[PDB]
Amino acid sequence: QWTDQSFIEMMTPHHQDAIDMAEMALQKAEHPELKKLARNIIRDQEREIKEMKTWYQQWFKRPVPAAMDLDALATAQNFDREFIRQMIPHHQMAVMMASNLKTNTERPEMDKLMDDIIRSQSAEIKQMKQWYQNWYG
Ligand SMILES: [Ag+]
Ligand SMILES: [Ag+]
Ligand SMILES: [Ag+]
Protein backbone atom coordinates (compact mmCIF):
# COMPACT_ATOMS: atom_id res chain seq x y z
CA GLN A 1 0.00 0.00 0.00
CA TRP A 2 1.72 3.13 -1.29
CA THR A 3 1.33 6.67 0.00
CA ASP A 4 2.25 9.84 -1.89
CA GLN A 5 5.47 9.99 0.12
CA SER A 6 6.58 6.36 -0.19
CA PHE A 7 5.59 6.31 -3.88
CA ILE A 8 7.88 9.24 -4.70
CA GLU A 9 10.70 7.79 -2.59
CA MET A 10 10.61 4.56 -4.58
CA MET A 11 9.48 5.75 -8.03
CA THR A 12 12.27 8.33 -8.26
CA PRO A 13 15.18 5.83 -8.29
CA HIS A 14 13.01 3.38 -10.25
CA HIS A 15 12.57 6.00 -12.98
CA GLN A 16 16.25 6.89 -12.80
CA ASP A 17 17.14 3.26 -13.56
CA ALA A 18 14.95 3.29 -16.68
CA ILE A 19 16.52 6.59 -17.75
CA ASP A 20 20.03 5.20 -17.27
CA MET A 21 19.21 2.16 -19.39
CA ALA A 22 17.61 4.34 -22.06
CA GLU A 23 20.74 6.48 -22.13
CA MET A 24 22.80 3.37 -22.86
CA ALA A 25 20.38 2.57 -25.71
CA LEU A 26 21.25 5.89 -27.37
CA GLN A 27 24.72 4.43 -27.90
CA LYS A 28 24.15 0.70 -28.14
CA ALA A 29 20.65 0.03 -29.51
CA GLU A 30 20.54 -1.90 -32.77
CA HIS A 31 17.02 -1.08 -33.97
CA PRO A 32 15.93 2.53 -34.60
CA GLU A 33 12.60 1.69 -32.96
CA LEU A 34 14.41 1.06 -29.68
CA LYS A 35 16.36 4.32 -29.91
CA LYS A 36 13.11 6.22 -30.44
CA LEU A 37 11.59 4.48 -27.41
CA ALA A 38 14.72 5.33 -25.41
CA ARG A 39 14.38 9.02 -26.27
CA ASN A 40 10.76 8.93 -25.11
CA ILE A 41 11.67 7.22 -21.84
CA ILE A 42 14.34 9.81 -21.10
CA ARG A 43 12.04 12.74 -21.92
CA ASP A 44 8.98 11.50 -20.04
CA GLN A 45 10.66 9.98 -17.01
CA GLU A 46 13.08 12.88 -16.44
CA ARG A 47 10.08 15.23 -16.47
CA GLU A 48 8.24 13.04 -13.98
CA ILE A 49 11.25 12.87 -11.65
CA LYS A 50 11.40 16.68 -11.72
CA GLU A 51 7.69 16.97 -10.89
CA MET A 52 7.88 14.42 -8.07
CA LYS A 53 10.90 16.17 -6.55
CA THR A 54 9.11 19.53 -6.64
CA TRP A 55 5.93 18.16 -5.07
CA TYR A 56 7.76 16.13 -2.43
CA GLN A 57 9.45 19.22 -1.05
CA GLN A 58 6.23 21.26 -1.15
CA TRP A 59 4.25 18.58 0.67
CA PHE A 60 6.81 17.28 3.14
CA LYS A 61 9.12 20.30 3.57
CA ARG A 62 12.27 18.32 2.77
CA PRO A 63 13.99 16.92 -0.32
CA VAL A 64 13.44 13.39 -1.62
CA PRO A 65 15.70 11.09 0.44
CA ALA A 66 18.25 9.05 -1.52
CA ALA A 67 17.30 -3.31 -9.39
CA MET A 68 18.09 -3.51 -13.11
CA ASP A 69 21.40 -4.94 -14.34
CA LEU A 70 23.40 -2.46 -16.44
CA ASP A 71 26.40 -4.81 -16.54
CA ALA A 72 24.33 -7.60 -18.09
CA LEU A 73 22.96 -5.14 -20.62
CA ALA A 74 26.35 -3.73 -21.66
CA THR A 75 27.84 -7.15 -22.43
CA ALA A 76 24.83 -8.76 -24.12
CA GLN A 77 25.37 -9.90 -27.71
CA ASN A 78 21.92 -8.53 -28.57
CA PHE A 79 21.54 -5.22 -26.74
CA ASP A 80 17.92 -4.84 -27.79
CA ARG A 81 16.95 -8.30 -26.56
CA GLU A 82 18.44 -7.72 -23.11
CA PHE A 83 17.02 -4.19 -22.93
CA ILE A 84 13.52 -5.54 -23.58
CA ARG A 85 13.97 -8.47 -21.19
CA GLN A 86 14.74 -6.08 -18.34
CA MET A 87 12.57 -3.11 -19.27
CA ILE A 88 9.25 -4.95 -19.62
CA PRO A 89 8.99 -6.14 -16.00
CA HIS A 90 10.54 -2.88 -14.83
CA HIS A 91 7.72 -1.00 -16.59
CA GLN A 92 5.17 -3.47 -15.22
CA MET A 93 6.34 -2.64 -11.70
CA ALA A 94 5.76 1.07 -12.35
CA VAL A 95 2.26 0.36 -13.69
CA MET A 96 1.46 -1.74 -10.61
CA MET A 97 2.67 0.92 -8.17
CA ALA A 98 0.83 3.67 -10.04
CA SER A 99 -2.43 1.71 -10.11
CA ASN A 100 -2.27 1.22 -6.35
CA LEU A 101 -1.39 4.79 -5.50
CA LYS A 102 -4.27 6.00 -7.67
CA THR A 103 -6.68 4.34 -5.22
CA ASN A 104 -4.88 5.75 -2.18
CA THR A 105 -4.11 9.36 -3.10
CA GLU A 106 -6.32 12.42 -2.70
CA ARG A 107 -3.95 14.69 -4.63
CA PRO A 108 -4.83 15.78 -8.17
CA GLU A 109 -1.09 16.05 -8.96
CA MET A 110 -0.60 12.38 -8.19
CA ASP A 111 -3.84 11.24 -9.82
CA LYS A 112 -2.78 12.80 -13.13
CA LEU A 113 0.78 11.49 -12.84
CA MET A 114 -0.50 7.97 -12.18
CA ASP A 115 -2.67 8.16 -15.31
CA ASP A 116 0.37 9.24 -17.34
CA ILE A 117 2.57 6.43 -16.00
CA ILE A 118 -0.08 3.76 -16.51
CA ARG A 119 -0.94 4.91 -20.04
CA SER A 120 2.57 5.55 -21.34
CA GLN A 121 4.38 2.60 -19.77
CA SER A 122 1.60 0.16 -20.69
CA ALA A 123 1.82 1.29 -24.32
CA GLU A 124 5.59 0.85 -24.24
CA ILE A 125 5.24 -2.66 -22.81
CA LYS A 126 2.93 -3.57 -25.71
CA GLN A 127 5.41 -2.16 -28.25
CA MET A 128 8.36 -3.98 -26.71
CA LYS A 129 6.51 -7.30 -26.59
CA GLN A 130 5.70 -7.06 -30.30
CA TRP A 131 9.24 -6.02 -31.25
CA TYR A 132 10.64 -8.94 -29.26
CA GLN A 133 8.46 -11.31 -31.28
CA ASN A 134 9.42 -9.65 -34.57
CA TRP A 135 13.15 -9.65 -33.82
CA TYR A 136 13.64 -12.84 -31.83
CA GLY A 137 10.46 -14.89 -32.17
AG1 LIG B 1 9.84 4.17 -12.60
AG1 LIG C 1 10.66 0.61 -16.76
AG1 LIG D 1 7.96 -1.42 -6.40
Amino acid at 127: Q
Least distant ligand from the CA of 18: 2
What technique was this entry resolved by? X-ray
Q: How far is the CA of 33 from the centre of ligand 1 (A)?
A: 21
Sequence-distant (≥ 6) Cβ neighbours of residue 27 within 8 angstroms: none
What are the counts of helices (DSSP H) followed by strands (DSSP E) for the chain? 5, 0
Q: How far is the CA of 93 from the centre of ligand 3 (A)?
A: 6
Q: How far is the CA of 67 from the centre of ligand 3 (A)?
A: 10
Domain positions in the chain: 1-137
Q: Does domain 1-137 have CATH number 1.20.1260.10?
A: yes
Rounded to whole angstroms, the Cα distance separating 65 from 47 reads 18
Instruction: Classify burial at 137, counting beta carbons within 10 Å of its beta carbon; exposed 0-12, middle 13-18, buried 19 or more.
Output: exposed
Q: How far is the CA of 66 from the centre of ligand 2 (A)?
A: 19
The per-residue DSSP string of 93-120 comes to HHHHHHHHHHHH---HHHHHHHHHHHHH
